[PDB]
Every structure is written in C-alpha cells, then in structure tokens.
Amino acid sequence: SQSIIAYTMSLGAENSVAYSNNSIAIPTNFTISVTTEILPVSMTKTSVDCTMYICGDSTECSNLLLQYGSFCTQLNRALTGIAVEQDKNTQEVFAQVKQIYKTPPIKDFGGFNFSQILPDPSKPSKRSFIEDLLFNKVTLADAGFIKQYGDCLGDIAARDLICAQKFNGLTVLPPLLTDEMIAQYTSALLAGTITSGWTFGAGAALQIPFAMQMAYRFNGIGVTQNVLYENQKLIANQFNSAIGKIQDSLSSTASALGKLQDVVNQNAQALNTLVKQLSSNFGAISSVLNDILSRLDPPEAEVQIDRLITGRLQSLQTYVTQQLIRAAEIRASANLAATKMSECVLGQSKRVDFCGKGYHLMSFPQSAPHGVVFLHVTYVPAQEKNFTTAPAICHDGKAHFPREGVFVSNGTHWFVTQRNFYEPQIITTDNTFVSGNCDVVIGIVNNTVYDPLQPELDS
Amino acid sequence: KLQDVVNQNAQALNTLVKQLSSNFGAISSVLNDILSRLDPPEAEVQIDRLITGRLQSLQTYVTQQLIRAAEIRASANLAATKMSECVLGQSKRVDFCGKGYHLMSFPQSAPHGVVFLHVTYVPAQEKNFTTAPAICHDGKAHFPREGVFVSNGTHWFVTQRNFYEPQIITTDNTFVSGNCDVVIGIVNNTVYDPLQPELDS
Amino acid sequence: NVFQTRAGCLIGAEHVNNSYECDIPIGAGICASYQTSQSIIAYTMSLGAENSVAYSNNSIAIPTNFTISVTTEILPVSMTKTSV
Numbered sequence A: 001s002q003s004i005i006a007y008t009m010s011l012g013a014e015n016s017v018a019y020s021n022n023s024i025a026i027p028t029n030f031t032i033s034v035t036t037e038i039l040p041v042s043m044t045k046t047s048v049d050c051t052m053y054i055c056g057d058s059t060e061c062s063n064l065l066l067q068y069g070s071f072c073t074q075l076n077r078a079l080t081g082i083a084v085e086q087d088k089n090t091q092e093v094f095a096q097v098k099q100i101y102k103t104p105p106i107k108d109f110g111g112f113n114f115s116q117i118l119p120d121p122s123k124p125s126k127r128s129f130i131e132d133l134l135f136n137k138v139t140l141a142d143a144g145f146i147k148q149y150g151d152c153l154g155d156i157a158a159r160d161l162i163c164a165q166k167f168n169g170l171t172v173l174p175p176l177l178t179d180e181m182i183a184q185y186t187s188a189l190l191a192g193t194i195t196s197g198w199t200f201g202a203g204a205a206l207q208i209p210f211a212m213q214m215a216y217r218f219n220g221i222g223v224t225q226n227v228l229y230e231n232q233k234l235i236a237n238q239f240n241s242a243i244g245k246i247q248d249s250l251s252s253t254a255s256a257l258g259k260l261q262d263v264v265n266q267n268a269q270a271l272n273t274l275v276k277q278l279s280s281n282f283g284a285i286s287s288v289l290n291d292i293l294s295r296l297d298p299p300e301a302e303v304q305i306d307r308l309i310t311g312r313l314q315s316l317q318t319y320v321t322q323q324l325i326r327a328a329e330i331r332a333s334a335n336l337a338a339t340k341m342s343e344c345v346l347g348q349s350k351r352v353d354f355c356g357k358g359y360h361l362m363s364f365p366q367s368a369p370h371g372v373v374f375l376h377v378t379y380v381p382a383q384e385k386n387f388t389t390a391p392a393i394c395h396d397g398k399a400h401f402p403r404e405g406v407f408v409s410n411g412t413h414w415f416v417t418q419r420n421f422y423e424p425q426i427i428t429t430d431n432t433f434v435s436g437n438c439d440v441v442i443g444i445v446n447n448t449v450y451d452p453l454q455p456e457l458d459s
Numbered sequence B: 001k002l003q004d005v006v007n008q009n010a011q012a013l014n015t016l017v018k019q020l021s022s023n024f025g026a027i028s029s030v031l032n033d034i035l036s037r038l039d040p041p042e043a044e045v046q047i048d049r050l051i052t053g054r055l056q057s058l059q060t061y062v063t064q065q066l067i068r069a070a071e072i073r074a075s076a077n078l079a080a081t082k083m084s085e086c087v088l089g090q091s092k093r094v095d096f097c098g099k100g101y102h103l104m105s106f107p108q109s110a111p112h113g114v115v116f117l118h119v120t121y122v123p124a125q126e127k128n129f130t131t132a133p134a135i136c137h138d139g140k141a142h143f144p145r146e147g148v149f150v151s152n153g154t155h156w157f158v159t160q161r162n163f164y165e166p167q168i169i170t171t172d173n174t175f176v177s178g179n180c181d182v183v184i185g186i187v188n189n190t191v192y193d194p195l196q197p198e199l200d201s
Numbered sequence C: 001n002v003f004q005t006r007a008g009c010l011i012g013a014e015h016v017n018n019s020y021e022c023d024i025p026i027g028a029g030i031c032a033s034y035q036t037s038q039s040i041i042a043y044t045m046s047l048g049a050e051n052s053v054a055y056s057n058n059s060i061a062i063p064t065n066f067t068i069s070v071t072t073e074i075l076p077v078s079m080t081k082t083s084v
C-alpha cells in the first residue's frame, strides 16, 4: 500500500520565541557537541595522453593528429596545472606548520579522551580510529596506483574500468602526499592543538594544560573559565560522549562522507565517460579507428579519421574543461579547508557558524580520502530559564551597568551573571560601573548595589 | 604567483597564435593557400574546417580565460578581504594574515596583484613555568580575570598568556568563584589584598 | 640504477635514505632532487623537523621575549584584459 506522495516542503518545526522588554533566557546548563564538517581538499590527479586517447596504437592516425599541433600540449598543460594545484591544495590545508608534533606518552588531559582522534601505531599506517572509519566509508580505486600491464593483460576483468581507462591513455597521477603522511600532518596539527593550545600556529608550540586550554577557550566565547573546572568532570564526559557519537554517526551512516565520495565519483565518472566518448562516430562511418584504416584509403580515411580526431579532441577539451571547472570548485573548498585549518583548528574562531553550530572551542582535523574532516568542538547552551532582566540599576541615584554580564532576577533579588552561562552573583561595585543617572535609561530598576568596602568601615 | 598570472596570460595568447598553424583536417592551415588553389565550392569545405577549428580555438581560449578569471577573482576577493579585515582593521582570524598574532598589514602595489606586508606578533623566547588553574587562600578558589597562574619554583605569580609579566596575585587580578573541593589541580597560595595594608593605619 | 617507488618504477634516480624538503615533487610521498659526481636522488619526502612538545598538567610555556615579523603575502588581483 506504499505509493509516491506529493507534499509541500516543510520549513522545519515552527518555534515562537517569547519576547518582552523585561525577559531574558540564560542557559543554566550546557552540552559539548562535536560536529563533523567534511570538506574536499584534493581531487584525482589525471594525466591524459592525447596522442594515445585519440589515435590508439595507430601511426596513420597519429600522423594526422600531429597536424593539429598544440592541442595535445595545451590539454596536458591544463591537466598538469590541476595536478600541481591539487598537491598545492593538500599542501595548504594539511601542512600549515613546519614541525611535526607528537603527543607525549603520559596522557593527562583532564578527563578528555582523545585516543579515538589520536593515531594508532597498531595499524600498518598510523591513523586515528576515526581516520580509519573515514577511509573505509569512501570507495577508491585499487590499493596503490601501480597496476601492472600483466594484471590487465593476464586477466581481463569483464568491464574493468581502470584498465580500460589506461589502455585509452587515461592515467591517474598519485598525489604527492600519501594518506600515511596526511595522517601524520593531522597528527602534528592535533598534537599541537592538544598539548600547545592555539600557540603553535602563531609561533613555537607552547605547552599549556588542556584544562587551562579549555578554560581560555571559554574566555574566548564569553564564558568565565570558572565554569570549566566546576564542570570539568562533566565537560570531559560530554566531550568523550560526543566523540563516541562520531563513531556511531560514521560507522552506521556511510552517506556522511558523500561530499568526498562525490569527488571520487565525479572523477571516476568523468574518466569513465571519457572512455565512453570513444564509441561515438562523430559523423564518421565508424567510431573504430581500425575499421576505417582497414577499409578506406588514406584520402578517404583522413576525411573519416579527422572526424574522429576532432570529436575525440573536443571530448578531451570537454573533459579538461570539466576538470578545470571542478578543480576550481575543489580549490575553493580547499581554500575553505585551509581557512578552517588555520582559524578553526589552529586558533579559536570568533566567526559565528564558521566551524558549525554552537560557540566554537577547538577543532580536530581528521584525514579523509581526497579531503579533510574537521571535528568541531562547540559550546551549545542546553538548559535555559526565563529571567526578569533590567538594563541598569538605581542605588544612590546613579545608573549601574554590568562590566560583564547581565542583570537578572529570580522574582525577588536582582543578580548579575554572564550572558552565556548562568552563575548568579551579588551585584557589586566590582561587577557594575557607575554611568549617568536614572532619569534617562529606559527600563531601569531600583536595586541595592553591595559595596565590598562597606563592611570594612564597620570595623 | 603574480609572474604566473603574466606568464599564463602570455602563454595562452601565444598558444592561441600557435593554434593557427593547425590544419584542422583541412589541406593547409594557411587561409591564403586555400583561396589561391581551390574554388569557393572546394574552398568553403576547406575554410569551414579552418573556421571551425580557429573558432573552437577561441572558444577554448575564452573558456581558459573564464576559468582563470574565476581563479583571479577568488584571489581578488581574498585580497579585498585581506585589504579590509587585515590592512584596514586588525584580524582576529588565526593565520589569515600569516603566521603569528597579527597587528597591522601594509598593502603594496604589485603587477597584476597586491603584496600585503603583515606585521605579526611572534613569541620569541619562552620558559617553562609551573602552572595551576586556581588558588586556595581562605578556602575559596581564585581564578585570573586575565592571564594565567605561574610559579618560578617558589612563589606563584599571575601574568598574561602571550607575554611574561609576572605580577603579585591579588584580588584585583583574580576573582573569587566556588571552593577548593572541586577544581582539579588547584593549589594553595596567598592572595594579596591591596586594602589589607590600609587597615594597618 | 633502478629503483621501485610507490608511484611506479623509477629509473635513473638513486635512493637516498635522508629525507629532505621536497625539491622536485614526484608523487606517492616521493620527491627528487639533483645533488652530489652529481646525480638525481630519490628520497621519501620529509614532513619537516619533528618536534616533541613536553606536556604535563602542571606546566605552561609563556614567552618572555618576542619578535616583530613582517611576512610578505602576495596575491593576484587582476589579470591581463584581452579583447580578441
């Protein structure tokens, strides 16, 4: 009884924010959420042989293609320009630092578990458990870029894509940086983020306790660092559970990496299509170059072969154009990944939703096939409560404004607390500064401002 | 990087001139050789092969330029962003102006581009310092308003993170939050009170 | 002088254990250079000098001195305007 249904697309659950001049909502509790953002860095490096692709194993045809001249050279000049920048895209993202950092053998992070994001020497290539998942959820070509001629010759796999591309002159150039090395760049960038904080991107790596690192990344998002060490046991548990949810997200759902799988698919589809382009007749009597040479004289073959050359060359010009446009898209995502490597992983991004939803703390790079996966640690307010608020306070007749934080009331007494976490404090002259009077500020209320020096005068 | 902009633009124009020596399947690449030999009926067959190739050559060049212009525009939008956020302002973005904490940037005109001179704050000489998250004076945890807690092996000092300027730990430097039964790694240290000597008078 | 790399069989380059900065990029983590009796050498690309950060709960490194570094970043703005 299942059928196709047609519905108006929902915009999401509608939420009505209750708004009033005297109301504010401050989170009393929060959650540490690790969000997975996945960006393509590099794309498949392809070197096409345009003498081989157009004229297969043919002297008569190749002599005709040489009349076309620079066409074969200018296509490879653009494909090489891609192959160079794809190694440059990977160079700009994964290596921002000259030094390779490693975590010390003794691990005390303050409860934070990083064994999932840290490399595992047990594997043949040193990689994190997540980078092992990232490599297993993206299907690539055969292991290694060396495919023997006898492997294709001795056994012909029925409809084998990679051999057929190579016998047509389509070669996949290996990236300059192996996945084993990329895992060691992400390891160096992660080991510096863990041990040295954000200081390793602006200079020499300066070790700081990861607790103090968390404390000073709360000062960046506007949360007083005292919130950390009170919740440190919880913040480490909320974080370690969030990393544990990255496993269940990657392992169960294999479509999270589809952005990077699309990079492999489009590169394979474009090469596979380029092989299918050879079955087109181009207006010639046959698409086969050997059928024309075995039938028509060179005068009658040149007419037919030049139709094949023009089409097979335009097919390469189409492919190279598809690659240059796609390489500009991958480079834009690589420049974005290189920006999210610097400003997000290496530093702490003040940019809202640049590292994803929530106030960002630090990001963890993870090597993925033809790309990078940033694990973004974000500060998300969890439990909130409405609180009667006021812009200022009238004590002696002078308006008091918070140096940091807001004025809130629980219905009886007015308290001062920071915006992004609820930590009610007695309103004092150290918390609030004196500006102007009470005849101006709109919504101002009357409240006693405690003076820490007042009890000292009682003695 | 800017020489490549001049080279690729010159190479693409120079290649486009070399594109004219291609026969395109026609008997000759020269347009005057065909007109001086074949009748218009036999020339149109040969010339249309040259036109189709020379036009596809321009369509190839224009495509190379549109793709390259989109790359230069992306670098120009990046340069216009580094002109505003870096030169005109002070970039909080890490390694957006280059390595080091950025102060100001100096634009310099270069051929077909711009050269930003980025003034960055780079920590030079560093020293290990025994640190603690908080301090126990009367039994209430003290946290720095700005900076860190450090020790030279005897006395605990408070100083900012990005430069070493040790200061006596005081109630003006540190704020009172919570107690000492929670914070992990907290130590015991006396927090000086600037008001305390005023009560001695 | 025949050597096997991860990118493929490499003939004419000598295998050198010393990992240096990448000079002529090859692929599959291999780079080449022309050095010393001078011949082409084939070496595994070095990732940079390995630095081990000493890390502990009770340790921090604060710079006592600093340097003002002016770095030169060079970006293309405009390209040659061509009217064909």
Ligand SMILES: *[C@@H]1O[C@H](CO)[C@@H](O[C@@H]2O[C@H](CO)[C@@H](O)[C@H](O)[C@H]2NC(C)=O)[C@H](O)[C@H]1NC(C)=O
Binding pocket: A107, A112, A113, A114, A115, A116
């Ligand atoms: C981080 O979490 C992992 C996974 O829970 C911990 O590794 C486990 O260690 C226990 C023994 O303590 C083993 O019984 C499990 O089989 C291990 N699991 C895996 C997948 O390796 C690791 O010890 C934790 N690290 C810290 C510092 O807490």
Ligand SMILES: *[C@@H]1O[C@H](CO)[C@@H](O[C@@H]2O[C@H](CO)[C@@H](O)[C@H](O)[C@H]2NC(C)=O)[C@H](O)[C@H]1NC(C)=O
Binding pocket: A029, A030, A031, A233, A234, A237, A238, A241, A382
């Ligand atoms: C704030 O929320 C966190 C959960 O995000 C609470 O921590 C959980 O508390 C429940 C009930 O005690 C436990 O069963 C969970 O195991 C805790 N999880 C973690 C990560 O520790 C925390 O107690 C809440 N705090 C307040 C003050 O409400």
Ligand SMILES: *[C@@H]1O[C@H](CO)[C@@H](O[C@@H]2O[C@H](CO)[C@@H](O)[C@H](O)[C@H]2NC(C)=O)[C@H](O)[C@H]1NC(C)=O
Binding pocket: A410, A411, A412, A413
């Ligand atoms: C709102 O907060 C104020 C201040 O914490 C509460 O007033 C205090 O109530 C406790 C008893 O629960 C007394 O011991 C304190 O002495 C009171 N304040 C002072 C300064 O003496 C008030 O009860 C709270 N109201 C609500 C509805 O929670």
Ligand SMILES: *[C@@H]1O[C@H](CO)[C@@H](O[C@@H]2O[C@H](CO)[C@@H](O)[C@H](O)[C@H]2NC(C)=O)[C@H](O)[C@H]1NC(C)=O
Binding pocket: A394, A445, A446
């Ligand atoms: C806060 O206190 C001020 C001062 O007592 C209040 O302003 C007075 O309001 C009354 C009654 O209308 C007048 O007779 C006075 O002339 C006002 N005095 C001043 C100094 O302005 C103000 O109304 C109080 N606000 C609240 C919300 O209690």
Ligand SMILES: *[C@@H]1O[C@H](CO)[C@@H](O[C@@H]2O[C@H](CO)[C@@H](O)[C@H](O)[C@H]2NC(C)=O)[C@H](O)[C@H]1NC(C)=O
Binding pocket: B152, B153, B154, B155
């Ligand atoms: C660490 O710093 C403290 C404080 O500066 C040093 O203690 C002082 O030592 C000087 C002599 O060098 C005395 O005149 C001061 O009176 C001491 N402090 C106070 C508050 O009296 C301590 O010697 C330093 N330790 C090291 C190893 O450098």
Ligand SMILES: *[C@@H]1O[C@H](CO)[C@@H](O[C@@H]2O[C@H](CO)[C@@H](O)[C@H](O)[C@H]2NC(C)=O)[C@H](O)[C@H]1NC(C)=O
Binding pocket: B136, B187, B188
């Ligand atoms: C800092 O001072 C506190 C308080 O004197 C110390 O805590 C005491 O530890 C002793 C010895 O085990 C106990 O008998 C007390 O019950 C503790 N008192 C309190 C108030 O907790 C603490 O050990 C000191 N820390 C350091 C590093 O010296």
Ligand SMILES: *[C@@H]1O[C@H](CO)[C@@H](O)[C@H](O)[C@H]1NC(C)=O
Binding pocket: A021, A022, A443
């Ligand atoms: C502000 O809030 C008060 C209640 O506290 C309400 O009576 C008033 O209408 C609101 N608007 C103005 C004008 O302040």
Ligand SMILES: *[C@@H]1O[C@H](CO)[C@@H](O)[C@H](O)[C@H]1NC(C)=O
Binding pocket: A018, A384, A385, A386
């Ligand atoms: C705050 O007021 C709004 C008014 O709609 C209400 O929905 C909300 O539940 C209140 N606060 C909480 C935390 O319930």
Ligand SMILES: *[C@@H]1O[C@H](CO)[C@@H](O)[C@H](O)[C@H]1NC(C)=O
Binding pocket: B126, B127, B128, C054
């Ligand atoms: C700090 O300790 C590390 C431990 O390896 C040491 O290498 C370093 O030299 C020490 N500090 C300085 C400035 O020497």
Ligand SMILES: *[C@@H]1O[C@H](CO)[C@@H](O)[C@H](O)[C@H]1NC(C)=O
Binding pocket: C017
């Ligand atoms: C280089 O490494 C190989 C393999 O371990 C070894 O056989 C050779 O002796 C080494 N040469 C040098 C110069 O150490």
Ligand SMILES: *[C@@H]1O[C@H](CO)[C@@H](O)[C@H](O)[C@H]1NC(C)=O
Binding pocket: A108, B185, C057, C058
């Ligand atoms: C913290 O540092 C102390 C030395 O100051 C060390 O004994 C302890 O093992 C470290 N780890 C913990 C659990 O604090």
